[PDB]
């Protein structure tokens, strides 16, 4: 339904993007470290980000779904443009009453979305509405991994009576956190990606060129028009 | 094209280097929102949940009535006085000498305090300390002898560079700090236009307004009658505003009661501290980028003075850290209105109702200086238009051993020493030891003033009602004939009359001439 409109539509944007200029780079397989000075050394390109976007890739068991990516858009310094996306699952938290009640809470979010997640973790997190957190207390969170933001959305819906009838593993629910997060905050945000700065694409990541503090070189057209109208009156 | 080129294309990717957004959303989505993602990637950079956007609650109560809206007092507004005041032109003086002489007993220390924080050295290499000190001492004695004198006043104005963001990195403002009884103390002020009436009369007419029917929102269902208890909260508070505004129409005289309640804040200066220096972190980011502009300007510039020369490979630079600075000061501004924006995920209108009160505080204490040594003509939120007169003094330059003569300004050094003794935090805990939880205290305030030079003349205008003037209007120029600032008045206005603006263009044209008051006046009647 909503899965395959938004995958033409991505088919849709990238059918148009074609023919700009703006083709899906694919990074070799880079069996290397981890490193940001080292670029001599890694299968990648630099290229200067001017724009990105959330969009829906494919896979390349699932459904008729993608995981969802965001689409970025560059400019080499050949004088041409290239495009590459990222896999990335997004997420949200949960808050709770107590840290080992945790288990009721994961057991009913195991049963009650079992065909909407992905997997699960525990995250630690500050919370700053708790008394003596500077002391070493943190707040114990739950962290869902989803494939999609549709999925993220659903799973949202889903969890819309029991935070609204809260305020037994039911009753334990209080509110979630990071739920209206948008989806390329979230990949710009925590793959700290930002948009004007030079990367070297590669397999292992998005690792940014320190070196060239300029920025590249854009094809700008500022276009104005002037139309017929009506007398004294809006076009 | 060249509008978009030369100030908004290294602006908006300047702004982008930092902001986790695409260019699009950052020129299309309010600045408070950009500011809310900056504070979204410095939260995740340092471990803190980012809370939720602020639903705000259907109905707050206080004293039995409901809350129509909740915001604290603003900011104050106030035309002293009106008129002609320039550089060519005298006026009479009515200087107080309980000032000159309180001030004159604080004089060798403040001009420590400019030399150790101001110029960021040292007392011993300056070498004219005591002739500029003496020569200061016999003027304002000169002025203290005989404060009734009438000469030319010259114009000044002081602003505060970046107030209300110096204001959060002094006092640590936070809006996740703020603990209820539950350690620095403030003073804030409350403000509500809440209604006349009373709880009961809410319950009778809410009860009256259960027996009655309402339409349907959603115009695609097959639902279209629906009754009062099926209803959202949205709809029934708006109809709630309505008939209890019909309702002290016709019980009450009046629509909104003003009070306003001084209540009080505690600020825990041992939470995780995220927020200062992010705001320090931009605040010392502008500073270095605006220190990086500057020796690319003159060194870059006069390190390849030919135009034969690809000197157009730098200009990219030099526009790329003008726009960077002029972003990371936007983005100060932007802070201080995103401290208050409904739907924020650090939302406390605390936070943001300590900051306008204690810069009211600041600028009264300022006000009430500029009182007792001169004429005050127009206050706003950054600084104060002020009249001194000519035999006050202005610029003095301290020579060091290396041979720099530093940069003195006389009343932006004692605005800036009568800050640092009544706004300094001494409590500003900071993470001295993160294993050990050890936390270091000391004195910060980064609260600095800076009045930049004599005006030729400065011309505001008043009512037509008695007891007050017009709010925010004012006339200020440069001492070389070019208009400086216009702020109230158009003199272009679209819309309002044509004549009246090109009226406005010629008056301030003709105000521009005489050295008698009466011949400019006239000339302006003429």
């Known amino acids: 339904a909503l899965s395959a409109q938004q995958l033409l539509n991505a088919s849709k944007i990238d059918d148009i993007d074609s023919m700009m200029g703006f083709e899906r780079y694919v990074p070799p397989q880079y069996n290397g470290r981890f490193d940001a000075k080292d670029i001599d050394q890694i299968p990648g390109r630099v290229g200067w980000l001017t724009n990105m976007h959330a969009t829906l890739v494919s896979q390349e068991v699932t459904t008729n779904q993608g995981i969802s990516g965001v689409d970025f858009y560059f400019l080499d310094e050949e004088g041409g443009s290239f495009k590459s996306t990222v896999v990335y699952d997004p997420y949200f938290f949960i808050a709770c009453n107590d840290e080992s009640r945790v288990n009721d809470v994961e057991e009913l979010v195991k049963k009650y979305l079992e065909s909407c997640l992905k997997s699960l973790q525990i995250i630690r997190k500050e919370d700053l509405t708790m008394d003596n957190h500077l002391l070493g207390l943190q707040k114990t969170l739950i962290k869902l991994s989803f494939v999609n933001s549709n999925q993220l959305f659903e799973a949202r819906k889903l969890l819309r009576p029991i935070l609204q009838d809260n305020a037994d593993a039911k009753h334990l629910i209080e509110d979630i956190r990071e739920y209206d997060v948008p989806y390329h905050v979230r990949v710009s945000i925590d793959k700290d990606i930002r948009v004007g700065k030079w990367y070297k694409v590669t397999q ?32 | 094209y060249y509008l978009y080129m030369k100030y908004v294309h290294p602006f908006i990717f300047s702004l982008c280097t930092i902001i986790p957004l695409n260019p699009d959303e950052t020129l299309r989505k309010g600045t408070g929102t950009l500011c809310e993602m900056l504070l979204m990637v410095q939260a995740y950079q340092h471990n803190i949940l980012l809370p939720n956007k602020h639903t705000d609650p259907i109905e707050r109560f206080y004293d039995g009535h409901l809350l129509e809206s909740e915001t604290y007092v603003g900011g104050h507004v106030e035309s002293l006085e009106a008129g002609v ?10 200087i107080d000498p309980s000032a000159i002489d309180e001030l004159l007993q604080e004089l060798p220390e403040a001009l420590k305090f400019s030399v150790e924080v101001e110029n960021k050295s040292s007392v011993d290499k300056v070498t004219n300390f005591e002739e500029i000190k003496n020569q200061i001492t016999q003027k304002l004695l000169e002025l203290k002898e005989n404060n009734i004198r009438n000469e030319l006043p010259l114009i000044y104005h002081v602003d505060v560079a970046s107030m209300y963001p110096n204001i959060m990195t002094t006092n640590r403002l936070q809006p996740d700090s703020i603990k209820a009884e539950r350690a620095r103390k403030l003073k804030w002020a409350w403000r509500g236009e809440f209604f006349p009436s009373k709880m009961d009369e809410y319950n009778m007419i809410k ?6 029917t309402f339409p349907n929102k959603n115009k695609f269902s097959k639902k279209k009658v629906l009754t009062f208890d099926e209803l959202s909260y949205a709809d029934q508070v708006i109809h709630i505003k309505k008939r209890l505004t019909e309702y002290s129409r016709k019980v009450y005289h009046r629509v909104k009661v003003s009070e306003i309640v001084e209540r009080e804040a505690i600020v825990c200066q041992r939470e995780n501290p995220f927020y200062v ?9 502008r500073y270095e980028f605006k220190g990086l502009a500057k020796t690319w300007k003159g060194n870059l510039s006069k390190i390849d003075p030919s135009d034969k020369h690809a000197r157009d490979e730098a200009k990219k630079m030099i526009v790329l850290y003008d726009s960077l600075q002029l972003a990371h000061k936007v983005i100060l501004n932007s802070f201080y209105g995103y401290v208050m924006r409904k739907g924020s995920r650090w939302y406390s209108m605390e936070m943001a109702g300590i900051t306008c009160l204690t810069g009211a505080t600041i600028i009264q204490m300022a006000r009430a200086l500029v009182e007792r040594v001169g004429r005050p003509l127009e206050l706003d939120t950054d600084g104060i238009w002020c009249i001194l007169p000519k035999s006050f003094p202005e610029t003095y330059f301290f020579t060091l051993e290396n041979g720099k003569k530093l940069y003195l300004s006389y009343p932006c050094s004692m605005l800036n020493y009568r800050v640092h003794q009544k706004f300094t935090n001494h409590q500003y805990q900071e993470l001295k030891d993160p294993l050990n939880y050890i936390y270091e205290t000391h004195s910060e305030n980064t609260i600095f003033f800076e009045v930049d030079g004599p005006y030729k003349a400065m011309i505001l205008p008043s009512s037509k009602e008695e007891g007050k003037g017009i709010k925010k209007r004012y006339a200020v120029f440069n001492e070389d004939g070019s208009l400086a600032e216009l702020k109230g008045f158009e003199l ?8 009246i603006k090109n009226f406005q263009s010629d008056i301030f044209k003709v105000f521009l001439e005489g050295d008698t008051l009466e011949g400019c006046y006239s000339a302006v009647a003429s």
């Open chain 2, 85 to 94: 005041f320039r550089s060519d032109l005298k006026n009479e003086f009515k």
């Open chain 1, 204 to 235: 292992q990541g998005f690792i940014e060129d320190t070196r060239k503090i300029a920025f590249a070189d854009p094809v700008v057209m500022a276009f104005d028009i002037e139309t017929t109208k009506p007398p004294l009156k809006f076009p």
């Open chain 2, 207 to 212: 009860r009256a307004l259960q027996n009655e």
């Open chain 2, 277 to 285: 220096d992010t705001v320090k972190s931009f605040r010392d980011r």
């Open chain 2, 492 to 499: 272009k206005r679209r819309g309002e009359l044509q004549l």
